[PDB]
From a paper:
Human dipeptidyl peptidase III (hDPP III), also known as enkephalinase B, is a member of the M49 family of zinc dependent metallopeptidases and cleaves dipeptides sequentially from the N-terminus of various bioactive peptide substrates. Crystal structures have so far been determined for DPP III from humans as well as from Saccharomyces cerevisiae. Despite the low sequence identity (36%) shared by the two proteins, both structures are very similar and consist of two lobes separated by a wide cleft. The “upper” lobe is mostly α-helical and contains the zinc binding site as well as the catalytically important residues. In both structures, two histidine residues (His-450 and His-455 in the human enzyme) and a glutamate (Glu-508) coordinate the zinc ion.
There are two types of endomorphins, which differ in one amino acid: endomorphin-1 (YPWF-NH2) and endomorphin-2 (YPFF-NH2). Proline containing peptides are more resistant to cleavage by peptidases, however hDPP III has been shown to act as a post-proline peptidase and to bind endomorphins with micromolar affinity. Endomorphin-2 binds to hDPP III similar to other peptides. Again, the N-terminus is bound by polar interactions with the conserved residues Asp-316, Asn-391 and Asn-394. Due to the proline at position 2, however, endomorphin-2 cannot form the canonical antiparallel β-strand interaction and the otherwise conserved interaction with Tyr-318 is missing. Also, His-568 is too far away (3.7 Å) in the present structure to form a hydrogen bond with the carbonyl group of the Pro-2. In contrast to the complexes with Met- and Leu-enkephalin, the carbonyl group of Pro-2 is coordinating the catalytic zinc ion.
Residue numbers in the entry:
A (entry chain A): 3 to 726
B (entry chain B): 1 to 4
Write the structure that this text describes.
Amino acid sequence: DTQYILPNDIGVSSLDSREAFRLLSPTERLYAYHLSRAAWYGGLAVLLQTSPEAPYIYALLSRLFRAQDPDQLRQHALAEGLTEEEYQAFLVYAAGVYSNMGNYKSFGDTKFVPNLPKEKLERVILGSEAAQQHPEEVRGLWQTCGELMFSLEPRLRHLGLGKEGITTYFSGNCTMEDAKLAQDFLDSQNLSAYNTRLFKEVDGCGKPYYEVRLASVLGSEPSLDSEVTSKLKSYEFRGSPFQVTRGDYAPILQKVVEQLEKAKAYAANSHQGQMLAQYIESFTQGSIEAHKRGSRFWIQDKGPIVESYIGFIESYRDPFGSRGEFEGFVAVVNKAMSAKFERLVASAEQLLKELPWPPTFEKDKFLTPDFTSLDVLTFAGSGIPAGINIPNYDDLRQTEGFKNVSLGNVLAVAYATQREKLTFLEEDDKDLYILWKGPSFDVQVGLHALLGHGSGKLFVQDEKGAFNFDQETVINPETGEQIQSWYRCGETWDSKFSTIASSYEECRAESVGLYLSLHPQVLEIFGFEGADAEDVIYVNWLNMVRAGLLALEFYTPEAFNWRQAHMQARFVILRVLLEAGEGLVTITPTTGSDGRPDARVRLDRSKIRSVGKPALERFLRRLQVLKSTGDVAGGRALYEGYATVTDAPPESFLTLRDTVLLRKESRKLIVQPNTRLEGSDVQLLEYEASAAGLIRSFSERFPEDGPELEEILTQLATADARFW
Amino acid sequence: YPFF
Ligand SMILES: [K+]
Ligand SMILES: [Mg+2]
Ligand SMILES: [Mg+2]
Ligand SMILES: [Zn+2]
């Protein structure tokens, strides 16, 4: 319960993937094997996308645990004066770095440090077997990342632009001003920011020069592609010098495409074969257009037995909100659980009409999307989600299609329901909570992805200003006047709304979730029918307003900034429901049984349909309108209004926040399995649900080129050392 | 667009 540290007794759970793996054919297993290898390899790039010291820390930890496993290192550490508690703190820290691919939390963007004396850890590291075998490599790493491993200077505590934040999407001297200037340049050149970073170097005269570096295997040398290499030049944008380069994470992405090529030899069909070819093209040249073509092929691969997606996909941890963090997952379709979601798709087109906006703001043609339940074998990157809506290419979402994915074996881990852990709830609600926490999620997730992220028309204009809608007929339902604002050529959702783009869209989807959860037909699809159907509704709403309070952990008062998109979104919904008044929801600061400050969330079950629905319907309509028209000014005025955290009566949120932090619970670490090629078969390796078990899972993750990866990450970090 |  201390900030910027991971507790020793932090929860660790193992991903359950054994049964899903057993059903796979030999060809499918080899397919999943190489894709997993490609994912895990690219996942290392997240280290470079997190903090300057992160690649060094991973290299140091990987060197340490290759020579001595957690039990071998224990005997050395304890012989050096460390207590078992202090050694446990180190194991938890290392598992944290592994599970996040960095020394910052993927959920909250806060730094975490080892919970033990630095000089004690030094004796362990410098006296380790890894140090005895490679004293130069180890002493160099400790000299480099040692201080930053423990430093909790205010400017290092959170991720972000400016001087009071850390980011490696940008050089250290970059600000929001620079990021905005870069995005305008990118938009004008029709160049996606997903696989790019921005570096600003001043000259001898103090004049800044901007480098937009794309991620690719290939560097400045001539290649077969012209779509990217024609962009590899110097520019003049508004007096500012710009240069588009590539070759970011080149040797890492080289490892990735090696495995994508091998996986391509086991593709079940031409859709899988061609999507992998485009991914290879994308990761080799640095073309998002190529990744788009791959994504287009990927959507056409419906109901696969082994589902996968890889690349610089989500843009949450970019403080500007346009650059993508690398991720890659490999999962097995769960035919049984995927049934309830396909029943939702079967009635999805109908349910879209129930949404609080006219079809002029809805997509033209309903494309029947793929919604499946998946059992994860591999999810590389900073963290694991519960459900996904992908691809994030909006031009594909409303013209080609999109896939919906629910990670069933991940949901099971999140169902860790303990009575003691349920904070800010009355005794009457705790029992109802545990009973329907699971079912309500499946319902919420189902609406969040399919009808949430999958709904909404975007107004666009091409190189000649003709619209994908009809300006002469379409009317803004909030003003009554014709459409005034829209998206121009090169503009995306992330490019316009930038810093609030992720939270805004997540809030819109979450609102659709609560809204359409009142629909009895939907309650049938998941099958609750009666009193149970009334119960899952209350719990879903109860969880939301509870989540809105818990969200205060992920807000930074000194920076007036939200750090987590989903939690900020849930705080907004709470503020909206609080705005409706009439005693629908109240927050009451109390005193806990332990004698510490506490709080209680009161939600009147009866006023959910009478007060709650008109509150959301009004709010949800204003969201979609501003989103469809790209009204960033109105969008920010609306969203950042509810997102405001003050100590105003009667809630006093700034006071509540101190209580939220005091009684906060750390998110579980998740251990993932490995796949090996013993002989001609693929075997699944499983690990202990612990810190040591998680460490072991990464010690066996790269058995062929482990030491090589450490050297690669080290040299890639050293190359960019001047930036921070 | 995931869901955490
Ligand atoms: K974003
Ligand atoms: Mg910074
Ligand atoms: Mg994580
Ligand atoms: Zn989502």
